[PDB]
Amino acid sequence: SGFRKMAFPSGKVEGCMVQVTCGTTTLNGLWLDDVVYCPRHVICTSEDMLNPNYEDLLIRKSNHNFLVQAGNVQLRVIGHSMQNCVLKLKVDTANPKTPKYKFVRIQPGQTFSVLACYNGSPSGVYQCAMRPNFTIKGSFLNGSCGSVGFNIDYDCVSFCYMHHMELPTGVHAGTDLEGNFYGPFVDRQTAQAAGTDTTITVNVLAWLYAAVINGDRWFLNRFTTTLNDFNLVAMKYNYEPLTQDHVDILGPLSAQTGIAVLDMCASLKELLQNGMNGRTILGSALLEDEFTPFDVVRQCSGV
Amino acid sequence: SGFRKMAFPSGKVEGCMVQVTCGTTTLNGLWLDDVVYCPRHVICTSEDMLNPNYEDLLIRKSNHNFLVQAGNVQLRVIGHSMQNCVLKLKVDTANPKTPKYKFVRIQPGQTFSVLACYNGSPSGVYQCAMRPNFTIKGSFLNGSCGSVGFNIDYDCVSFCYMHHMELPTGVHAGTDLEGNFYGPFVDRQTAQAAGTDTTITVNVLAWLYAAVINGDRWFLNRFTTTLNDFNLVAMKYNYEPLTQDHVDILGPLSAQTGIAVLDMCASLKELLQNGMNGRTILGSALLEDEFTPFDVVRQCSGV
Ligand SMILES: C[C@H](NC(=O)[C@@H](c1cccnc1)N(C(=O)c1ccco1)c1ccc(-c2ccccc2)cc1)c1ccccc1
């Protein structure tokens, strides 16, 4: 029993974190095979922040201008390219700690483990969700950039995120490892406001299912609801519209807890309409939406 | 900016997690040098749970009865011993991924990263605190036992916890790597009730200091208090008595935020007396006490 904000083991990803220096600017790179992926804003200077032209900013840079350091060891950059908002620095040496890996682009509401890094050094690990506004409520300081979000499918590290920037609102924006920012964010120092941060309803339901599985069942009522009636109250509370997919995705937890998904929607409604009445669920005084149905299954089947 | 429940990178500890089978029973072992540490209740059977005699239960067991598996590779157990509530299984092979390491016994209120394991396989990572009742509110399933809590001092993994058992209350009890349970817990299936789970006041203050550093400063009042007056209200709310050490330990955060520690105690008092009024601090609707002053410094200086 028990339920915590759990990350994947970062070991496989630690062995991939290198330091990437471009002049004054230093941040993290991901070293897989003979390629080091980092935010392309490594190349940007003290005044390039506002409107940097990267193609233009790349011409000025060469292989020897990218100082790729793997712990204490400098790597030979034997070729570089820009893919969207990432640099792919070709190095002469394949990373011998390269795990089996994929670059997935993760849907909003999906979760991943962040290995926060400074100077290619793993600092800490924490679970994150892709917010429906395609921000992530991370912990990143200066130099945290090029830190990756990831998911482990047994042996296979599925890199879903590379951290780029903090928004004016303490919130984080970054890209997949193909360099495509999640959301409308751009690697420039301009007015970039977050959209509405909606609650990942299916995740809250999964969290409630985790709560019930861990004996926190108080918020259960004798009520049911309809998807449509629940979704009316969901929208009022800035909750993601719930779909049959969400219900299907919660089927495992339903089947596990013998609680129809719509009876849990009924409990969620009462929690949303009435608040939590000073009570806690899974040591939280609000409804956690940064655990997927898969995350709950994982943390309650011990994958 | 941003503030999350961050763990240390588990990589150094992953390379130390082995599987430990004794007959039907399987759990995790920690492989450092030529020694594999696991909960001694690995040796206990289907009826030994109630009152097991371990010395007696060890006689029946030999080196070849301890199946130490490192991934797909069995290790030769060339000697075994019991140290308090841990077995130290001597193996012929030093763990080549042995990090620089110490066994620290951590004070209650101190935090550590848990690498949750099943069959010597890292499942997930999360930050934990030693509760003042010497329980830990973990996420551990069946077979999670022999999972270690730890702290990383740059290169040096300070193993503080080995997970043993879940209490009747969904809460977790275990030992240091010298095998000494934190708290009054014993590796037996008997009435083991948690004491009062008091709030780690110094940690809540650190969390508030992290909140203020991350722009969440609303709970700041124009009030101050005295240690004694604050401690009167602390005790009412089952908060750890605050000491000059706690104030000293918060000195860094005080100095960083230019907020006297006692003005923050004043804010904590108003939060405790008045609750949070539906408001959140650092995405929490209650006062987080599972972040140390050191943890906040670390996550807000990027160590
Ligand atoms: C306010 C925000 N502040 C930041 O983003 C902070 C940073 C703070 C904490 C966590 N995450 C990143 N930041 C870093 O820590 C960093 C810089 C280099 C390596 O790391 C950074 C600074 C600059 C850039 C950048 C520069 C040129 C062109 C385009 C972008 C990118 C990141 C920001 C600054 C500038 C632009 C957008 C957002």
Ligand SMILES: C[C@H](NC(=O)[C@@H](c1cccnc1)N(C(=O)c1ccco1)c1ccc(-c2ccccc2)cc1)c1ccccc1
């Ligand atoms: C209720 C509790 N249930 C548990 O503790 C669960 C377990 C569940 C989730 C997380 N953490 C551990 N548990 C395991 O997952 C496990 C067993 C072996 C390897 O792993 C376990 C079962 C048994 C023992 C044990 C056996 C003989 C003598 C003394 C102790 C120890 C652990 C418990 C059972 C028995 C005794 C105390 C507490």
